Symmetry: C2
Subunit: 194 residues, 2 copies
């Protein structure tokens, strides 16, 4: 039934743009929408990756590695899966492992890689692959792991037990002013619901 | 350490604006960020997303999802029922309202998240994730009556909670839909809890 008729640019920045989107609704009537898109997407299967990093060590409970950063759009600190945009020509797996190492210092091993999934499809066209990665915390490579943040990147690492993730998140939100990411919360919820 | 210095409007639509955010990086250097906000927020958050757990005796527990044409995505997406919280509406009540409009189901609140961010590197958009149980054996949920508001066109897809990630992958493989990130994160955690 439904499909895009036209996409009129409204305002283009260096990083983001706003479009008036015109589409066919499923009655046969023309309608419009305001859409956001990034300016950076090239041939990549998605804008970005987020990494679900399962830190595994012998005689430790598995931990989920998370990162805390200032997020200008939010006016505040956010707790999120390690994540970044996919470079031109880069595979999602490579981007995941690169971003993981840059933001946390850990070197991971790929476990699985999602199809491109939508970040906020009522608002934007942005997509990521969600890449599950196991981190062998017994390997010396991951012993005293040093984040190699990029220019103007400043990230703290927070590793939380998978078996208590949601309470550990609720506890952190109760103790400082910060926002947990919706994907992080959803994953912690399902850990509880299973 | 980091904080917002100022916000310059770049472009304001009916529904969404684009701002240039000037912020202080932790080294003492001033830096800029392109940020998207909705124009609709008062509110604890912009919206709600409902995790609807359909419980029928002698049946697998299902998670109820909606498929909708998403203009920014230029395609159909599979998502948790969701909408914006009406000014003067609680997140809980928004959840039940939305769940009923989108799916026809009448649920009960199990729990409700703090405001969580949707894509904090791009937008300030936030939601409450609201876990609802649906008594599928109740007479009110026998033939669930979905109420599409103006310009909403919503298919309901219920999937077994214990195979959710495999079932979502099937739909993407077979049907060229995009799965929402929050839905995929929850589906992953269901598999990862084992
Ligand atoms: C040299 O300038 C920068 O790298 C600042 N980055 C952004 O403004 C930005 C906005 C969005 C979306 O993603 N990155
Ligand atoms: Cl439940
Ligand atoms: Mg990042
Ligand atoms: Mg990075
Ligand atoms: Mg909706
Ligand atoms: Mg609705």
């Amino acid at each position: 039934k439904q499909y895009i008729i036209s996409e009129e640019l409204i305002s283009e920045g260096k990083w983001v743009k706003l479009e008036k989107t015109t589409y066919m609704d499923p009655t046969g009537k023309t309608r419009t929408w305001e859409s956001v898109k990034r300016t950076t997407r090239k041939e990549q299967t998605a804008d970005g990756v987020a990494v679900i990093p399962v830190l595994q060590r012998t005689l430790h409970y598995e931990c989920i590695v998370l990162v805390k950063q200032f997020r200008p759009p939010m006016g505040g600190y956010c707790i999120e899966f390690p994540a970044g945009l996919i470079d031109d020509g880069e595979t999602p797996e490579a981007a995941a492992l690169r971003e993981l190492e840059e933001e946390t210092g850990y070197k991971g091993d790929i476990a699985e890689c999602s199809p491109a999934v939508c970040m906020d499809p009522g608002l934007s066209n942005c997509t990521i692959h969600i890449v599950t990665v196991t981190i062998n915390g017994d390997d010396a490579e991951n012993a005293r792991p040093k984040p190699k943040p990029g220019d103007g990147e400043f990230v703290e690492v927070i590793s939380l037990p998978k078996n208590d993730l949601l309470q550990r998140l609720d506890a952190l939100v109760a103790e400082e002013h910060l926002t947990v990411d919706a994907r992080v919360y959803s994953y912690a919820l399902a850990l509880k619901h299973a």
